[PDB]
Amino acid sequence: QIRQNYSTEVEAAVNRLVNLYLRASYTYLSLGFYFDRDDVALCGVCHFFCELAEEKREGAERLLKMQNQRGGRALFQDLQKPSQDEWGTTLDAMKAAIVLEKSLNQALLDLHALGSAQADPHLCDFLESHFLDEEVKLIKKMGDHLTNIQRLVGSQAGLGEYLFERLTLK
Amino acid sequence: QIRQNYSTEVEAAVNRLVNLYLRASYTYLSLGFYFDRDDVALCGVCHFFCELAEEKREGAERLLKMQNQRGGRALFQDLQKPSQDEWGTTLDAMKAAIVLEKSLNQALLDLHALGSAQADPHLCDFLESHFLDEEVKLIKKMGDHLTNIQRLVGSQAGLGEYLFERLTLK
Amino acid sequence: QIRQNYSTEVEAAVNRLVNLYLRASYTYLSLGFYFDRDDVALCGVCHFFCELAEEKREGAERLLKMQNQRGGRALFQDLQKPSQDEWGTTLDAMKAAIVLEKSLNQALLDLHALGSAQADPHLCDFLESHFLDEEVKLIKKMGDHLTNIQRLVGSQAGLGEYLFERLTLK
Amino acid sequence: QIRQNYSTEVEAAVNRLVNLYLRASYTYLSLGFYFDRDDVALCGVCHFFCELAEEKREGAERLLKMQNQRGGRALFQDLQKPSQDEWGTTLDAMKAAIVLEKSLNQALLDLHALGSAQADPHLCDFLESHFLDEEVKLIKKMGDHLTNIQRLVGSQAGLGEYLFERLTLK
Amino acid sequence: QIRQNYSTEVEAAVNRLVNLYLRASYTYLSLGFYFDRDDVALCGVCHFFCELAEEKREGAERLLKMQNQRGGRALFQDLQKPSQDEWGTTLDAMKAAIVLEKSLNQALLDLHALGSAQADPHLCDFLESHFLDEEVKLIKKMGDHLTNIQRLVGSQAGLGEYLFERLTLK
Numbered sequence A, B, C, D, E: 001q002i003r004q005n006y007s008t009e010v011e012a013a014v015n016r017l018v019n020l021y022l023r024a025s026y027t028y029l030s031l032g033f034y035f036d037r038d039d040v041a042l043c044g045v046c047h048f049f050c051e052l053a054e055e056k057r058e059g060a061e062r063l064l065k066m067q068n069q070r071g072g073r074a075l076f077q078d079l080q081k082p083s084q085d086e087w088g089t090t091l092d093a094m095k096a097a098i099v100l101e102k103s104l105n106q107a108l109l110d111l112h113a114l115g116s117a118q119a120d121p122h123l124c125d126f127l128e129s130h131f132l133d134e135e136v137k138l139i140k141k142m143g144d145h146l147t148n149i150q151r152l153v154g155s156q157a158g159l160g161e162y163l164f165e166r167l168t169l170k
């Protein structure tokens, strides 16, 4: 037995966070293919979201690996379908993505608070090394996108949406 | 004599499909030079269509080569002049091109149905290997273009048409 | 609109098959991490299943891409949790995996039958090019593994399980 | 003692000009980070100003080095906070920057006049070699920017501001 | 004097932890040479433990270096002889090693708790950067070994012990 200073509460919260990252991965998968539709056709937006799907899956896998390293047991639940089947405009999609990220970030913060209360400094190191800063960086990038998309909706919404995709998402 | 399991009905349909691909080649030739007119001057659009002319000719030549491999006899008809002398806007031209492609695709599907009824699995392999998927891919790309062109016609049609050509057709 | 010769029945079946491949991906994800447990610790088995997770996800993504190419609409459902939380011996796990693969293969065959009834030769080409042969190859490899694992269970089950992992899964 | 033909009046004016260049450096530092705000998010503008911060600091350091070479004594004052905490639009910011540059340029000209009255040809060579032409070049570039930004404010101010940043500040 | 926010309690605990790492280094030194005995002769096991001796010494040296950086004073005690002169089977030895590691890990956790109570964030950063994760990784690897060794003791203990050494410790 390797397990040491690893609470059942942390263990459960880690499994839940795995589920959240995989669901976020699935949502980005859905976002990406929506933007590849022939009637939506924003290549840059598709690529931005499909790269996010991959990053979220890798996040989940790092959690799992850590679960195993600590002597916890991975438990998998259903992955709930994404919150929408169609994602509207690039603006709507980027808003949906930032809401999703802030929810992941809150989960990460709830898990740090749990780790601190349980006195689990390995867990806190883990999250600091691989999660907190990356999530902050992503959220800042999404905020930057949203600001640029918004400046580009004048009365020429189609034009702005094309330009953003061609000149930022490049 | 090499001919084996190659019906006179398939043979005729192959010659007809050759004629269709060559006519499509000629239409793209006309589309390309229209966009090179000094009073139209959309370089990217010219290059997109001239590359299509070449792909359609190569399609025809692969058919012919297969006709000969099976022991059929190539028979050539008049190539009808393209359906228009002037092709309007990039939008009009891309619509005309997608109609043309869907007609080629339907011909390809009619020839697969004929091959299946004649029990000609070489023919069906041929079309699968070199035609069905390529036609599907092209049609999807044209749908994507049309969607982007359409989003770019606000009330600034000239501006949109320039940007599409500069930033997509690149 | 690009959609041509693409039935609503094929479209639904493609979405279902996407769901099956993603669920199979999730099952392999669970299989892989079970074998990375400190109390199971079969590195080779973990790597075999984690590579399968990735192949199944890529399968799903190729389906989705094809869905979009044909003018279908991707629709995502819940991904059901894997059928087990713990997977027993390497033998048990490989049996579970071959059952899973035969179920995917049957789904692939049901979709070819549907494509043939709908007269959809693009769909049939798609499955032939990327799915049928790969699934057959994998199933044969799993059969080969199962045979070797089984020959290795004498009365020295632990020894056999170690050797298989060290000398085959390498 | 090395000091030769170096008036106390030149010496003081050099220290003042150091202070001006460092303050200009600090203003550009503030301009740069304002444009990196998530609610402003104009990467190109941030980079243009942060490069200016660095050039102004280097200007100051060349002055200081010359002060020491001539046997003067560097004296440092407070660096006053920048004139604004928020800098408005890219247009507003570029106007603020050109005003700042013209004030530095005037200081440079006042110091050449002082050097000529004191008969200090080393000082005049120094300013000619490293300051006068560089300041003129920068001011011309800022004038060019301002002209392009202004042409880009139609009634689509957001669009113009995005394009300038993407296609000029690149 | 450099010392700042560095308690006498942390300082003592750091010296104690140095002693623990050096003793662990000495124990691995003894484990390694036991496995090089002509009547034990398990090369792979010798190399695994001698590499551990080195890692534990380096751990000690990083502590010492940090002690000096913070203005603490290194104080050395006797290094107690290892707990055994002969270490039994590879299984016995790996069990002894995991007990040793869990004791080091507990010491590391006691020192983080002490650092948190003393409000010493440099100390906590230090341990996170170089100790907590490495200790967790090692313990997981030892758990994995133990599991494989245990599966290999059937009634053919000699055979299992040879195979583990040849095919894992490689």
Ligand SMILES: [Au+]
Pocket: A032, A033, A036, A045, A046, A047, A049, A050
């Ligand atoms: Au995508």
Ligand SMILES: [Au+]
Pocket: A032, A036, A043, A044, A045, A046, A047, A048, A050
């Ligand atoms: Au994409």
Ligand SMILES: [Au+]
Pocket: A032, A033, A050, C061
């Ligand atoms: Au994708």
Ligand SMILES: [Au+]
Pocket: A111, A112, A113, A115, A116, A123, A124
């Ligand atoms: Au924490």
Ligand SMILES: [Au+]
Pocket: A115, A116, A120, A121, A124, A125
């Ligand atoms: Au913490």
Ligand SMILES: [Au+]
Pocket: A115, A116, A117, A119, A120, A121, A124
């Ligand atoms: Au903590």
Ligand SMILES: [Au+]
Pocket: A094, A141, A142, A143, A145, A146
């Ligand atoms: Au974003």
Ligand SMILES: [Au+]
Pocket: A048, A094, A142, A145, A146
């Ligand atoms: Au975005």
Ligand SMILES: [Au+]
Pocket: A141, A145, A168, A169
């Ligand atoms: Au971006």
Ligand SMILES: [Au+]
Pocket: B032, B033, B036, B045, B046, B047, B049, B050
């Ligand atoms: Au052309």
Ligand SMILES: [Au+]
Pocket: B032, B036, B043, B044, B045, B046, B047, B048, B050
């Ligand atoms: Au051309």
Ligand SMILES: [Au+]
Pocket: B032, B033, B050
């Ligand atoms: Au041409």
Ligand SMILES: [Au+]
Pocket: B111, B112, B113, B115, B116, B123, B124, C121
């Ligand atoms: Au066919």
Ligand SMILES: [Au+]
Pocket: B115, B116, B120, B121, B124, B125
């Ligand atoms: Au066929």
Ligand SMILES: [Au+]
Pocket: B115, B116, B117, B119, B120, B121, B124
């Ligand atoms: Au056929």
Ligand SMILES: [Au+]
Pocket: B094, B141, B142, B143, B145, B146
């Ligand atoms: Au097109």
